[PDB]
Structure formats: structure tokens, C-alpha cells
């Protein structure tokens, strides 16, 4: 999954 | 916040938007204080608003 | 035959084709849609019922609770249209929905409820449409313009061979729903299918097939056909179908049953296929190398151990054949591939597909849709099931389902609104078929693929959005633990729904300000189709193919009338007879042509039904019974047009006007104009300002009455009768006996709009056109609105025009105007402006409206009363104080010299600041109305009390003198009833009037009628009482002003603007022009009788622009005015009525085989005289759009007067008296005054207010702003050597703060020298670059 998206909320959820 | 839920509980009890006189006898405070609360400036308009 | 409103002035029709279908109600596109919106529909199909049934019932999370819908109703509006236009609020009706909350019982699937609570909850107010299709939203009238968008469904576009070097067409499919995601399919240059969702990253197309729970064998079963090989103990014989061999060349001998058919190296010809079919060959013997590349179909496993011999979709070879030979398998199924007819695209896509299971495909879909988070099984399943297969997040339409089934050639037109496996499979199959070679790609500009939304549909969509917004909160509230014995009113907030509806109606791209400077402007704004808006293309991303005019626009969308500029072809206008389908597709009427005759029955055909039939032309002659008089006629069959036999035609056009809109059907001689000039004339005809006196079009079309009546400017009689009382502001009609209901007293009262302002600050005024004691009938006009004359549209004035060059005063497009045109007030217009003066509550104290203004003399306060407001009727010029207002201010903190001056002169300062309202500089009007609004906590000044007394007196007076008229009519009805059946000649007037309604009669219904009249009278009395109390309580009540403002004073000024050089005038044929001189009367060219011309126009504008329609309009106007002058001469000599009859009949009998027989011998010798008095300023002439008057008829009309048939007369010079060397074209042309007046364009500035961040002047003429000296002007000054002019342009005149004050002081000190400095914008730029991490600095 690292690193596909920027989305700093999605990273927190992950 | 209290004034925003009292004036919306009287929307569905009267059928139309109330008046600052009627909130005064409902919120138990003088009309002058309610006029001050309603005169609080909201979030300012962005200067990049297309006009 | 002729109506009483049309016997006054009959327009002479030159059209020759008889009309079959009369022009429909023009504003029926705006009125039917909103009628469908707010309408109690027993079936949940249209409007609010559909939204309520598609959202409710709301059920909690299995918590044995449910909120369900019962009914709804629209309440009475608080204020009507006029009151809400005055106050400044929305005209709307309160929506009051009746709900029902039910609580179930535990341990029951659908068991009996324990308690029910049925309550009516108010949820928002929805704005209401007026009688004309407009909305009053914040006091202003707005129009919700219709939208032309792509219909939902599946559209198989292509790529046209571009975007690739080799030039391959990459066919693609796309499923568009009303609400949901986009399931695009496509091809890559390698012929592999792909699918992308929401225009995201591209994925192989078999991933979605696997996600739909399909194996590889099932996919190969769906998208391919089998080739059954067999092991017949030797050589691997296979079953053969002869059709499979088409387009093939076998390198061996195709020999079956020992019979040679195709030799070595021979192509399998059609004759070979026929021979094989005749011999009925079903089994052949093939070489073992024939399977060297054939792809197997299914999974063949070993019989002994179960190991995988060959998986599905894998090409067989010799070793694989051997491994399946001794294993025990005899039937071998292989795919049918080809290169021309049956391509193997799905097989290759499977070979590129990374996944191999349903869960892997779902995980790949999840990683494409939501990248960067770990995918769960149930999360991926939920995402896929909520993409296209959920009723909430996806809905195609009814229209989408119909188009989806039509495109796939199904038989049903209705079905589920969500996709299924069959739909996706069928779309993929049809895309593959189009790739193979059969099938055609769609065109997205066809009007069978584009759909029309309107006010009702868009309003319903926004209401449904609000409903789901409130259903989220309702579902959260029911599950929140509480039981709670609550009513169905504590869960619903009316602010989401009302906010959504207000957002749509007030702030939207399709909800725009109405154009109100004409009846034509309003009518053509309401009948407007726009490709833009929420859900359509933009002005920048739109190409060339949506702007073009398609062959399917014929009869549905006007080709010429479109705005020229950034959006040309995006703001189209509806045609005259065009309608809208049940689904929203434009359709146009055609009349059925049976076996050999053209019947009168009319069928409406959409753009897809139109292509199947062959449709004749309206310019086709019929032999008085139906048959085409020719042997073959010209028609259009499938887009293209050619000549067809008269036995082949299926339909015929209804009219010659059906191709053009209602603005382009008002141009006489349109077929002689160039299309560019016709477009310009159509677009300029709706900018014309209504003048002081509407004249009439002397050369019209016959579409004027339709535009004037089908709009809302006139006053049209609802029922027939006799005019009982006329006045400048009221008409009272006494209805006929046969048009009255049995109970009511039949009188109609029409109150006229007098001197109100429109959106464009023009004047709206209705003046009656009937007289006292005059018969009217239903549909006759009673008053004329702006730009209307006796019920006809009259946009401008028709004036004598000469086409000649006159000393360079009409050089490029300029116009030379006589002084009689400005003396007679032909182009004088009235403009009304609204000026407001708000008194707010500042921090230092409130602002007052006193007349005691400091620093002003007694001369300035002469037009103000004791209350500080201007009088009504006062003539105020620029700078005069209208409303005197003073604001408190702090401490001045004056300079040492100022305080020395104060000490010397002893004049102390004033603590208040003069902030009074004053007339804008340049305008000079008359105050016609003052309105005062006061907050409900503030004492009213004497002026507001006087206004209130006037309003209360007027309300009581109006109600009293409507009740007087109604009572008088009712008592006259009673008296007329009492004459028959109980006759009383003079036994009635002695007793009082009140006792006439309580007298007895026989045992019939006449006593019931007398009692019904008495009951009606009592109801009228009590209605007057209740209306008077309501009006009093509504007048005396306070106003709901904005927070902060104490009172508002509004002043209305009426300005009469005469014509002057610089004003823009035009005609109906795209011939615009700015007038340049106002010539004296004795300087204008004059003919043999001394009559000067009014307008001199340049002949050079005609040949280069090809608007020849104006020359013919000039000649026909000359002929019409000649007939009028002959009638006027006969009327001035008061000869006789027989002479008038003879001449007017001879004038109405021209010309060559026209319709409109008049038969003037049935007139009554007093209707002849009114007609002749109305025809003494010129006989009006109707020239239809493409039917028209031939020039031979114009010559005949010119002969019928005494004018030369050349159209040209000998003209003399007013200044020298010498005739011009050649005859010049004189005649009458209908001129218009466009709304581009020069006193709204002129601006000038020296020093004013400067901006805030960049200290530069502001924008033009609203805040006294400067002219932009942009980059191209800087290049122009650099192309010269003007280095000092440029430097003063960009430093001292604009931006340098110290330098501009220094320059002003230098100029007023007589020294012209600049001290430039550096602009403030560069300092702003340095600070903004420096407030990044970058260090920019000036160094020396
Ligand atoms: C019943 C009526 C035809 C009668 C057969 C069907 C056929 C097409 C249907 C409309 C379209 O779907 C578009 C649109 C979809 C949204 O839902 C909002 C409503 C709209 C207007 C629909 C209302 C109604 O349902 C229509 C008119
Ligand atoms: C001719 C007609 C009756 C015919 C039988 C009479 C009876 C009622 C009369 C009107 C009312 O009085 C109200 C009003 C009073 C104003 O002062 C003058 C105008 C008004 C419109 C009057 C005009 C006229 O006089 C009316 C219509």
C-alpha cells in the first residue's frame, strides 16, 4: 500500500 | 447555538421564520440582547468570490 | 369572420399557403413543466409525489420504527406577486407534508404496530410560478431557462481514426445514468477490451466479468462459438459448418467422403460454400497441424490422476494434443476466431487479465477505485455492489432505460433503473459487433440523443436532494436510543430542503435575471434552450460539433437565432411549433399524407421517427383537394433531400414558419437576407427600448399579435361583454348573460399597471385601447403593454428613409437623422431608476434622516420636507439632495493651521457627517414615488405616517369601490331577474334595494337564483370586511429588514431620454448604426412636394452584406404609405362612404391568388369609417416568413397608389435646391432604438477612489473608475518611442502614491513635471515573493 495515495487522512486510517 | 435551535423549533410550530420579539419571550432575555446576537458578523466573504 | 378587435385595423396578408395548424401558446414549455411539478398525482410519477415516494418510508436500523408519508399540500402564499415585488421577498407557498410515525412490536417481521401518530410537518417553502412563467425570488422576476443535455443510456462513440499514428478507430461504449457512475468500455490499439469507471485508470474488461461471478469457461461460452473436434481413431476429424469457411484459404485439399472440393492454395469461394451446402457436409478430415494455434474452450483434466492437461483459453499444440489423446478425452471444444468477422478480443483480454478469481477481481477494482488502503473482502464486495447495482446510489431513468433498450434492439421499453449482468454483457457484445464490422457508431449531436430538462424536473431533482439530506438525519435520530413518544416533527429540519430549493432558484446558472425591455425579449427568454449549466458542457471545453447546426434541427431548434460570441450554438432557441415529448425529446408537427391526398390530421414526430419517413415540403402546391399538383415533389428522406414521386411521400410540413423561432419569424423578407445578417437582426430585435408611443409595423409578418397576446404585457378579456367604465387605470366589463355563472354577479375588473420599472430600468405602462360602451368578446385585448399597438407588437417607429450618401455623415454605418424625428418625440423613452438610502446602526450611534444637514445652504434643502425626504413630483437634477442623512463621527484631530483658523473665526466643528443620498451626476428626472421601510422598533417619522395614511386610504377606497361595482352589478342582475317570472314594472324602486334579494316567487329555481344572488351579496360584504382588515394589518405592520439597518428610503426617478448623436439605432435586417447628426428640416433632401426624408442611410452597406430584405421592405413600406395617403386624402375631403368602400376593397383585393378574403360589403358603414381612420397613416401589410410577397405584387401595390414602380423618385437638395443627378430609393423602413444609449456609455475620470491592496483606480463608471491601459497598449507605446508617456501611464497616473499627489499639485501650480518613483504594485510583488522562502531584493 506504501505508497499509492497522498490523502493524509487515508494514511492515518491505514 | 441555543438561539439556533430555539428559532428552528418555532419554525415547525408556527409555519414561518420567527421574529426577534418572539424569541425574547421564548429565550427569556431582552430583545436588545437578541438583536446583538443576531448582529454578530458571520464568516467574512472571500475577496476572490466571483461577483 | 373578423373579431371586433381586428375589424379596427385589418392587416393585408400577402401569404398564399393556407394555414392548417395555428401557432400554439408560446410559453407552454415553462407552464406545463412546473404544472407537472406541483400537482397532486395519484400515481407517483411527476413532481413532489415522486420524490416523497422515492425517499419515504424511512426505516431505522431494524429498530421497529418507521416514518412514512401520507400526503402533502401547498399552502396559501403570504404575499401575492405585487406585495412581494414591493417588499423584496420571494413569492412562494408553504409546503406542509402529512407524515405518520409507526412503532412496531418486538419479535415480529411485519407484526401489528403498537402505536401510531399522524402529524402534519412543515418542510420548506417552494417558489411559485406566475401566470407568465416567471418567478419572483427576491423581488426580482427570474426565468429558469431550459437545458439541452445528453440523454441517459448507452452511446457507442468512436475515435474517427485519430489519437494514433497508424490511424486505427478505437470504438468505445459508455453507459450514462441520470444519477450514478460511468461504465465506460473501450479498445486499445492492440484490440484488447478495457473498462474504466468514473473516467479513472484503465482496467481489462474481463475483470468486471469475473466480478459478476463468471468463470473463464462461461465467458468463452458467452462471447464465442465452438468448433467441435473429435478423435475418430485417426487424423482428428472435426465437425464442419460451411459458413465457418467464408473468407478462408486452405493450403491442403478439403476433401470429404472422398470428394475433392477445394484444391491446394485455393481460396474457399462462395461457389465452394454453395457446393458444400448442397452436398450437406457436416464432418471433414483435417490435418493434425490444423490445431497448431486453436484456442481450447474449457478445462480438460486428466482422467487418471486429475491433473490439469490444458486450462481454459490456452492454444493447443502437438504435445498438448498428444497429452489429451491417450488421457481419455474424445470431444475437444475450441474457440472460433477469425480476422475479419469473428475477432478474438475477449480471449486476448483474458490473456492480459491479471486476476483469476472473483475475489481477486474485486480487490483489483477496490485498488483502482480507492488506492492506498488495505482492501477487505466485505469492503470490496460492498463497493462493487454499491457501484451500479444499488437502487440508492444508481438510477438510470425511465428515459435511460428506454434508450438503453432501444439501442440494444430489445422489445420492452420499461424495466429496472439499475444495471444487471445482462445489460453489461449486451453492451460488450454490441461493442464487439461494431468492432467486427456490423453496426454504426452514434452521433452525440443528433436530437434523438439529446434531451430537454425544464423547471419542474430540475426543481424536483433539487427537492429530492434536500429530501435525502433530511433522511440522513431522520435515520440517525430514530436509531439514537430514544423510543421516545415523540411526534413526527422533532426529527425533521426544514432548513436542508428549503436551503437546497433556495440554492437552486436563487444561485444557479440556469436561474437568470429576466430580459424585460420588450414582450419579445421576455417571450424569447422563456423559450430558450441552453447547453450549459449544471450537467452540461462549458464555454471553453466545447468543440465545433456542438456549435454546428445539425440536419435534425429542422423544425425543432432555430438555425439563425443564437448569440454571437463565446457561446454561439450553446444558447439555441426553440422553434414556433416545436413541442417536447413524453420523455423530453423535441418534436415537430407534420400532417399525414394518405394514399394520394394531404390530410389535415397532424402527427408529432421526434428526430428518430423523422428519419424513417419521407417528408414533403411546405412549398408544395395542392390542387384544392389534397393531391400534389406536380408529378414528383421535393422532400427530405434521411437527412439528405432530393425529388421523390408523389406516391412515395408520407408526411408534409405544417407551415413555412416552423423552421424558425418566434424572433426570426418577425423579420419580413427573411429569405432575401444573408444568414449572418438574419442572425444579427434577430439578436438585435430584442434590445429595442419601448418608445413614448408604439406605432405599428407598417410591413409586418402577422406574428405580431401572437407575440403580443401570448406574452403577459397586454390585458386580455377573460369573458365577453360590454365595457361599462374605462379609465387610465381600470376597465370594468359587464359580462354577457350567456357567459355568467348562475350565482355570481358577472363583472370583470381589470386593474392596469401604470409606470413601473422593469429589470432594465425601462418603463412598464398599460393604457386602455377600448372605449366606453363598446362590445368585447373573449380573447380581445383591453389594454396595451410596453411596445404594443392595438394588440400588435410594435418595437419601433417606421420613418421615411432615403438610401444615398450625404456629405459623409453616414460614412461607415452612421445614420443622419432629421430634426422632425427629435421634435415629434418619436424615439423618446422613459427610464425609471430606484435609489435607496439605508440608515444603519453604527458603533458611534445611529444615523438619522434629519433635514438639518451641516454645511449645506437653505437652497439645497428647498426640495426636502420637515422629515428630510424629497417631495413627490419634485424635478431633481444631478447633485440635488434626495434623502438627507447624517452619520455621527469621532474626533476630527485637525491640523495646526486648521485649529488656528477655527480660533480666528470661532466656528466650532460638527460632530455629524453629511452622508445624504443625492441624485447621480448627469441624470435629471422627476420623483414619482417614495417608499419608506422601518424596522419594528423605531419611531416612524411624519413622512412614513403620511405614506401609511395614503396606503390605508387607498386600500379602503379600492375595496369600497370594488364592492360598489359588484353590488351594483348584482342588484342589476336581481332587477333583470325580477322582470320575468313575477313581473314588477314600477313595484320595485319604491322599496329599498336591500329588499330586492328577499322576495318570493313560484316553486321553481328562480327563487333559488334570487337566494343564490343574496348569498353571493352577503359573501361579498363579508369578503370586503375581511380583506379590509387583512390590508390594514399588513400595511401597519413593520418590516423585516437586514440586521443592522434601521430604515430604508427608496426614491424613484423618471427620466425622459430624447434621441441624440451617439445613440444606436437599427432595423430588423441586421443593419445597425450609430446616429451621427441631427440635421435641420430645411437641410434634408426633399421630393417634388416638399416633404423631407426622415433618415438618410448609406447605400454602400447593402451590397457587401447581402441583406436585400431591407430594400424590399423600403419599397413595400412606400407602397403601404401610398395607400394610406390616398385613404387620408379621401378622408380629408369627406367625399362619401361608397368611395372609401370601393378603394379599400380594391386595396384588399391584391394580389396574385392570396388567402385572406375580406369581403368589405358585410361592414356596417360605421366600421368602414373606423377602419379608414385607422388606415390613414398607412395600410399595414403582412409578409409571412418564407411565403412573402413577390416583387410583382409590390409593383402592383405601387401602381395602385400613384407611386413609381421603380421605387425611386427624383430628390432635391435642401441646402442648394438642386436635384440629385440620379433617382434615389425613398420609402418607409421600421427603425428600432436599441438599448445602447450614449448617456450610459460616456465616462470620464481625472482622480477618484483607488483600490486597496494595489493602489490603482477601480472599474468603470459604477465606482468612477479609470480606463485599463493593458499590455497591448504598452506594446503600442513601446513601438513608438514614447518612453515618457509610458512612464507616466504606469507610475504617476496609476500606482505611485506620492507621485500622483505631487503631480496633482504640480498641475494646479502650473508646472507640468513628473517625479516618478516606483509603483506600489512592485512592492506588493516583492513582499509576496519574499513571503515564500525566496529572497528577492533590489541592489545597487
Ligand atoms: C411516467 C413518465 C412516462 C409515462 C410512461 C416517465 C417517462 C420519463 C420520466 C422522466 C425521466 O425518467 C427523466 C426524469 C428522471 C428523474 O427521476 C426525475 C423525473 C423524470 C422527469 C422522469 C418523470 C416520469 O417518470 C417520466 C416523465
Ligand atoms: C355605470 C355603473 C352602473 C351601471 C348600471 C356605475 C355603478 C358603480 C360605478 C362605479 C362605482 O361607483 C365605483 C367607482 C366610484 C368612483 O367614484 C367613480 C368610478 C366608479 C368605478 C364608478 C363608475 C360607474 O359610475 C359605475 C361603474
Question: Explain this structure to me?
Answer:
- Chain A: It is found in: Cytoplasm.
- Chain A: This is RNA polymerase sigma factor RpoD.
- Chain A: Belongs to the sigma-70 factor family. RpoD/SigA subfamily.
- Chain A: It comes from Escherichia coli.
- The structure is cut from a larger assembly and holds 2 copies of chain A and 1 copy of chain C (1340 residues).
- Chain A is mainly α and 14 residues long.
- Chain A contains 1 helix and no strands.
- The N and C termini of chain A lie close together (9 Å).
- Chain C is an alpha+beta fold and 1340 residues long.
- Chain C has a domain at 829-946 and 1053-1056: OB fold (Dihydrolipoamide Acetyltransferase, E2P).
- Helix content of chain C is 27%, strand content 20%.
- Chain C is built from 30 helices and 62 strands.
- In chain C, helix 23 packs antiparallel against helix 24 (1137-1148).
- Residues 724-725, 732, 961, 964-965, 968, 972 of chain C line the site of one chapso.
The beta-strand count of chain A equals 0
Shape assignment of chain A: flat
Helical content class of chain A: 40-55%
Major sheet attributes of chain A: none
Most extensive interface:
B-C, 11 and 16 residues
* Molecular shape of chain C: globular
PDB class: transcription/dna
Keywords: DNA-dependent RNA polymerase, transcription, DNA promoter, open complex, TRANSCRIPTION-DNA complex
Entry title: Cryo-EM structure of Escherichia coli RNA polymerase bound to T7A1 promoter DNA
Chains A, B: RNA polymerase sigma factor RpoD
Q: Which terms would index this structure?
A:
part of a larger assembly, 3 chains, A: 14 residues, 0% strand, C: 1340 residues, alpha+beta, OB fold (Dihydrolipoamide Acetyltransferase, E2P), 6-stranded mixed β-barrel, 30 helices, 62 strands, globular, binds chapso, transcription (chain C), transferase (chain C), DNA-dir_RNA_pol_su2 (chain C)
Amino acid at each position: 500500500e506504501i505508497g499509492r495515495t497522498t490523502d493524509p487522512v487515508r494514511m492515518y486510517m491505514r | 447555538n441555543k438561539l439556533n435551535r430555539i428559532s428552528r423549533q418555532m419554525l415547525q410550530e408556527m409555519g414561518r421564520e420567527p421574529t426577534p420579539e418572539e424569541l425574547a419571550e421564548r429565550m427569556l432575555m431582552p430583545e436588545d440582547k437578541i438583536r446583538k446576537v443576531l448582529k454578530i458578523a458571520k464568516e467574512p466573504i472571500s475577496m476572490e468570490t466571483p461577483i | 369572420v373578423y373579431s371586433y378587435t381586428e375589424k379596427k385595423r385589418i392587416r393585408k396578408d400577402f401569404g398564399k399557403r393556407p394555414q392548417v395548424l395555428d401557432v400554439p401558446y408560446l410559453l407552454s414549455i415553462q407552464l406545463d413543466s412546473f404544472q407537472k411539478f406541483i400537482e397532486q398525482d395519484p400515481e407517483g410519477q411527476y413532481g413532489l409525489e415522486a420524490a416523497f415516494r422515492s425517499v419515504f418510508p424511512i426505516q431505522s436500523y431494524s429498530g421497529n420504527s418507521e416514518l412514512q408519508y401520507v400526503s402533502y399540500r401547498l399552502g396559501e402564499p403570504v404575499f401575492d406577486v405585487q406585495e412581494c415585488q414591493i417588499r423584496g421577498v420571494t413569492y412562494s407557498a408553504p409546503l406542509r407534508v402529512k407524515l405518520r410515525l409507526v412503532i412496531y412490536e418486538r419479535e415480529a417481521p411485519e407484526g401489528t404496530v403498537k402505536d401510531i401518530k399522524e402529524q402534519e410537518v412543515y418542510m420548506g417553502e417552494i417558489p411559485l410560478m406566475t401566470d407568465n412563467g416567471t418567478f419572483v425570488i427576491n423581488g426580482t422576476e427570474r426565468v429558469i431557462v431550459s437545458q439541452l443535455h445528453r440523454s441517459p443510456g448507452v452511446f457507442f462513440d468512436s475515435d474517427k481514426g485519430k489519437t494514433h499514428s497508424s490511424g486505427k478507430v478505437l470504438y468505445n461504449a459508455r453507459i450514462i445514468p441520470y444519477r450514478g457512475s460511468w461504465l465506460d468500455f473501450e479498445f486499445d490499439p492492440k484490440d484488447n477490451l478495457f473498462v474504466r469507471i468514473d473516467r479513472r485508470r484503465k482496467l481489462p474488461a474481463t475483470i468486471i466479468l469475473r466480478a459478476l461471478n463468471y468463470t473463464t469457461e462461461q465467458i468463452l461460452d458467452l462471447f464465442f462459438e465452438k468448433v467441435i473436434f473429435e478423435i475418430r481413431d485417426n487424423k482428428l476429424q472435426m465437425e464442419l459448418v460451411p459458413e465457418r469457411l467464408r473468407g478462408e484459404t486452405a493450403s491442403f485439399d478439403i476433401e470429404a467422403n472422398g470428394k475433392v472440393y477445394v484444391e491446394k492454395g485455393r481460396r474457399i469461394t462462395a461457389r465452394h460454400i454453395r457446393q458444400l451446402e448442397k452436398d450437406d457436409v457436416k464432418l471433414i478430415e483435417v490435418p493434425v497441424e490444423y490445431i497448431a494455434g486453436k484456442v481450447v474452450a474449457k478445462d480438460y483434466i486428466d482422467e487418471s490422476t486429475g491433473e490439469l492437461i490444458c486450462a481454459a483459453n490456452m492454444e493447443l499444440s502437438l504435445d498438448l494434443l498428444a497429452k489429451l489423446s491417450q488421457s481419455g478425452h474424445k470431444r475437444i471444444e475450441t474457440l472460433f476466431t477469425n480476422d475479419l468477422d469473428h475477432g478474438p478480443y475477449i480471449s486476448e483480454t483474458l490473456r492480459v487479465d491479471p486476476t483469476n478469481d472473483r475475489l481477486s477481481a474485486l480487490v483489483e477494482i477496490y485498488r483502482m477505485m480507492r488506492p492506498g488502503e488495505p482492501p477487505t473482502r466485505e469492503a470490496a464486495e460492498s463497493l462493487f455492489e454499491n457501484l451500479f447495482f444499488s437502487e440508492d446510489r444508481y438510477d438510470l431513468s425511465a428515459v435511460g432505460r428506454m434508450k438503453f433498450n432501444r439501442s440494444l434492439l430489445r422489445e420492452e421499453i420499461e424495466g429496472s433503473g439499475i444495471l444487471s449482468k445482462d445489460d453489461i454483457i449486451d453492451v460488450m457484445k454490441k461493442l464487439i459487433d461494431i468492432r467486427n464490422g456490423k453496426g454504426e457508431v452514434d452521433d452525440i449531436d443528433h436530437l434523438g440523443n439529446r434531451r430537454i430538462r425544464s423547471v419542474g424536473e430540475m426543481a424536483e431533482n433539487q427537492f429530492r436532494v434536500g429530501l435525502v439530506r433530511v433522511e440522513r438525519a431522520v435515520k440517525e435520530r430514530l436509531s439514537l436510543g430514544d423510543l421516545d413518544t415523540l411526534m413526527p416533527q422533532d426529527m425533521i429540519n426544514a432548513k436542508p430542503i428549503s436551503a437546497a430549493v433556495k440554492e437552486f432558484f436563487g444561485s444557479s446558472q440556469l436561474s437568470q435575471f429576466m430580459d424585460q425591455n420588450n414582450p419579445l425579449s421576455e417571450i424569447t427568454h422563456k423559450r430558450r434552450i441552453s447547453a450549459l449549466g449544471p450537467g452540461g458542457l462549458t464555454r471553453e471545453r466545447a468543440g465545433f460539433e456542438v456549435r454546428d447546426v445539425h440536419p435534425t434541427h429542422y423544425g425543432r431548434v432555430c438555425p439563425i437565432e443564437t448569440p454571437e460570441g463565446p457561446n454561439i450554438g450553446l444558447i439555441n432557441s426553440l422553434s414556433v411549433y416545436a413541442q417536447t415529448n413524453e420523455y423530453g425529446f423535441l418534436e415537430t408537427p407534420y400532417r399525414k399524407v394518405t394514399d394520394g391526398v394531404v390530410t389535415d390530421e397532424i402527427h408529432y414526430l421526434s428526430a428518430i421517427e423523422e428519419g424513417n419517413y419521407v417528408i414533403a415540403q411546405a412549398n408544395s402546391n395542392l390542387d384544392e383537394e389534397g393531391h400534389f399538383v406536380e408529378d414528383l415533389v421535393t422532400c427530405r428522406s434521411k437527412g439528405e433531400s432530393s425529388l421523390f414521386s408523389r406516391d412515395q411521400v408520407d408526411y408534409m410540413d405544417v407551415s413555412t414558419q416552423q423552421v424558425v423561432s418566434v424572433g426570426a419569424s418577425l423579420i419580413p423578407f427573411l429569405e432575401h437576407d444573408d444568414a449572418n445578417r438574419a442572425l444579427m437582426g434577430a439578436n438585435m430585435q430584442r434590445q429595442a427600448v419601448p418608445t413614448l408611443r408604439a406605432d405599428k409595423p407598417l410591413v409586418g409578418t402577422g406574428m405580431e399579435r401572437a407575440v403580443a397576446v401570448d406574452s403577459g404585457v397586454t390585458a386580455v378579456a377573460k369573458r365577453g361583454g360590454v365595457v361599462q367604465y374605462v379609465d387610465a387605470s381600470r376597465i370594468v366589463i359587464k359580462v354577457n348573460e350567456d357567459e355568467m355563472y348562475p350565482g355570481e354577479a358577472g363583472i370583470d375588473i381589470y386593474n392596469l399597471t401604470k409606470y413601473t420599472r422593469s429589470n432594465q430600468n425601462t418603463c412598464i405602462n398599460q393604457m386602455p385601447c377600448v372605449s366606453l360602451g363598446e362590445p368585447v368578446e373573449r380573447g380581445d385585448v383591453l389594454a396595451d403593454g410596453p411596445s404594443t399597438d392595438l394588440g400588435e407588437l410594435a418595437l419601433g417607429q417606421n420613418m421615411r428613409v432615403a438610401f444615398m450618401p450625404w456629405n459623409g455623415y453616414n460614412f461607415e454605418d452612421s445614420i443622419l437623422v432629421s430634426e422632425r424625428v427629435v421634435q415629434e418625440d418619436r424615439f423618446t423613452t422613459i427610464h425609471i431608476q430606484e435609489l435607496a438610502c439605508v440608515s444603519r446602526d453604527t458603533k458611534l450611534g445611529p444615523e438619522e434622516i434629519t433635514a438639518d444637514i451641516p454645511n449645506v445652504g437653505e437652497a439645497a434643502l428647498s426640495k426636502l420636507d420637515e422629515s428630510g425626504i424629497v417631495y413627490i413630483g419634485a424635478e431633481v437634477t444631478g447633485g440635488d439632495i434626495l434623502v438627507g442623512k447624517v452619520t455621527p463621527k469621532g474626533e476630527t484631530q485637525l491640523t495646526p493651521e486648521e485649529k488656528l483658523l477655527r480660533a480666528i473665526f470661532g466656528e466650532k466643528a460638527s460632530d455629524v457627517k453629511d452622508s445624504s443620498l443625492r441624485v447621480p451626476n448627469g441624470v435629471s428626472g422627476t420623483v414619482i414615488d417614495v417608499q419608506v421601510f422601518t424596522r419594528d422598533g423605531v419611531e416612524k417619522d411624519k413622512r412614513a405616517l403620511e405614506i401609511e395614511e395614503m396606503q390605508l386610504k387607498q386600500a379602503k377606497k379600492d375595496l369600497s369601490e370594488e364592492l360598489q361595482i359588484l353590488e351594483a352589478g348584482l342588484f342589476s342582475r336581481i332587477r333583470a331577474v325580477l322582470v320575468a317570472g313575477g313581473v314588477e314594472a314600477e313595484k320595485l324602486d319604491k322599496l329599498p334595494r336591500d329588499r330586492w334579494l328577499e322576495l318570493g316567487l313560484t316553486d321553481e329555481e328562480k327563487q333559488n337564483q334570487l337566494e343564490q344572488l343574496a348569498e353571493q351579496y352577503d359573501e361579498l360584504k363579508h369578503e370586503f370586511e375581511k380583506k379590509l382588515e387583512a390590508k390594514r394589518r399588513k400595511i401597519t405592520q413593520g418590516d423585516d429588514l437586514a440586521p443592522g439597518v434601521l430604515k430604508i428610503v427608496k426614491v424613484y426617478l423618471a427620466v425622459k431620454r430624447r434621441i441624440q448623436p451617439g445613440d444606436k439605432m437599427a432595423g430588423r435586417h441586421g443593419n445597425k448604426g450609430v446616429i451621427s447628426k441631427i440635421n435641420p428640416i430645411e437641410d434634408m433632401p426633399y421630393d417634388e412636394n416638399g416633404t423631407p426624408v426622415d433618415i438618410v442611410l448609406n447605400p454602400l452597406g447593402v451590397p457587401s452584406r447581402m441583406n436585400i430584405g431591407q430594400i424590399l421592405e423600403t419599397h413595400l413600406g412606400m407602397a403601404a404609405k401610398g395607400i394610406g395617403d390616398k385613404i387620408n386624402a379621401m378622408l380629408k375631403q369627406q367625399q362619401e362612404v361608397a368611395k372609401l368602400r370601393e378603394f379599400i376593397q380594391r386595396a384588399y383585393d391584391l394580389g396574385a391568388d392570396v388567402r385572406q378574403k375580406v369581403d368589405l360589403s358585410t361592414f356596417s358603414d360605421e366600421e368602414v369609417m373606423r377602419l379608414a381612420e385607422n388606415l390613414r397613416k398607412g395600410m399595414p401589410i403582412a409578409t409571412p416568413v418564407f411565403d412573402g410577397a413577390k416583387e410583382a405584387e409590390i409593383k402592383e401595390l405601387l401602381k395602385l397608389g400613384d407611386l413609381p414602380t421603380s421605387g425611386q423618385i427624383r430628390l432635391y437638395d435642401g441646402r442648394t435646391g438642386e436635384q440629385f443627378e440620379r433617382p434615389v430609393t425613398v420609402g418607409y423602413m421600421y427603425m428600432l432604438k436599441l438599448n445602447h444609449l450614449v448617456d450610459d456609455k460616456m465616462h470620464a475620470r481625472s482622480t477618484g477612489s483607488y483600490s486597496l491592496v494595489t493602489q490603482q483606480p477601480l472599474g468603470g463608471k459604477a465606482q468612477f473608475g479609470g480606463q485599463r491601459f493593458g499590455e497591448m497598449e504598452v506594446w503600442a507605446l513601446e513601438a513608438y518611442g514614447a518612453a515618457y508617456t509610458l512612464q507616466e501611464m504606469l507610475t504617476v497616473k496609476s500606482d505611485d502614491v506620492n507621485g500622483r499627489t505631487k503631480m496633482y499639485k504640480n498641475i494646479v501650480d502650473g508646472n507640468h513635471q513628473m517625479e516618478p518613483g516606483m509603483p506600489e504594485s512592485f512592492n506588493v510583488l516583492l513582499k509576496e515573493i519574499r513571503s515564500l522562502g525566496i529572497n528577492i531584493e533590489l541592489e545597487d
